[PDB]
């Protein structure tokens, strides 16, 4: 099994509200803020605040995840925006 799918829930939990770069199958790359990771499928959910002022939500399938790298720890402001979501 893949590195990402073997991570403990307590490790997945520490990514929440951090900005991350994810490499996935077939050279697909993503960058965004972690909302959660599904402990059943290991799907990672990212939030993006895009250049046009709109907001997207992206799930990357756990079986397709290759690497996950933290880029930014966040701050109080972004954390509150993300907490208010859903």
């Amino acid at each position: 099994m893949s590195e990402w799918m073997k991570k403990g829930p307590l490790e997945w939990q520490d990514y929440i509200y951090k900005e991350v770069r994810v490499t996935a199958s077939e050279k697909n790359e993503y960058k965004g803020w972690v909302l959660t990771t599904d402990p059943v499928s290991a799907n990672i959910v990212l939030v993006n605040f895009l250049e046009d002022g709109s907001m997207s939500v992206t799930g990357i399938m756990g079986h397709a995840v290759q690497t996950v790298e933290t880029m930014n720890e966040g701050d109080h402001r972004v954390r509150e925006k993300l907490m208010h979501l859903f």
Binding site: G8, P9, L10, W12, Q13, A24, S25, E26, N28, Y30, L35, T36, T37, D38, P39, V40, S41, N43, V45, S54, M55, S56, V57, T58, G59, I60, M61, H63, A64, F86
Partner: protein, 85 residues
């Protein structure tokens, strides 16, 4: 006193899962763009998944011959999905 890591893990599992289900429920009725294996992209309205997250139930699946009313997409064929709340 130090709480068992098994208990801590299972509680974190519940919190992660609850957030994930919330994210899927917020996606209901929106157009989502699926990045598929084999370099392909397809768009559809999201309806549901099963609890094992093995299948997505969708409606209004776009195809070259026209929009299909309903379909089931296997999560093993999917790399990513995106939408805009």
């Amino acid at each position: 006193a130090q709480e068992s890591l098994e208990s801590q893990e299972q509680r974190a599992r519940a919190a992660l899962r609850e957030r994930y289900l919330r994210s899927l429920l917020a996606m209901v009725g929106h157009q989502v763009s699926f990045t598929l294996h084999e370099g392909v992209r397809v768009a559809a309205h999201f309806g549901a998944t099963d609890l094992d997250v093995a299948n997505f139930y969708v409606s209004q699946l776009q195809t070259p011959i026209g929009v299909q009313a309903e379909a089931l997409l296997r999560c093993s064929d999917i790399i990513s999905y995106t939408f805009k709340p």
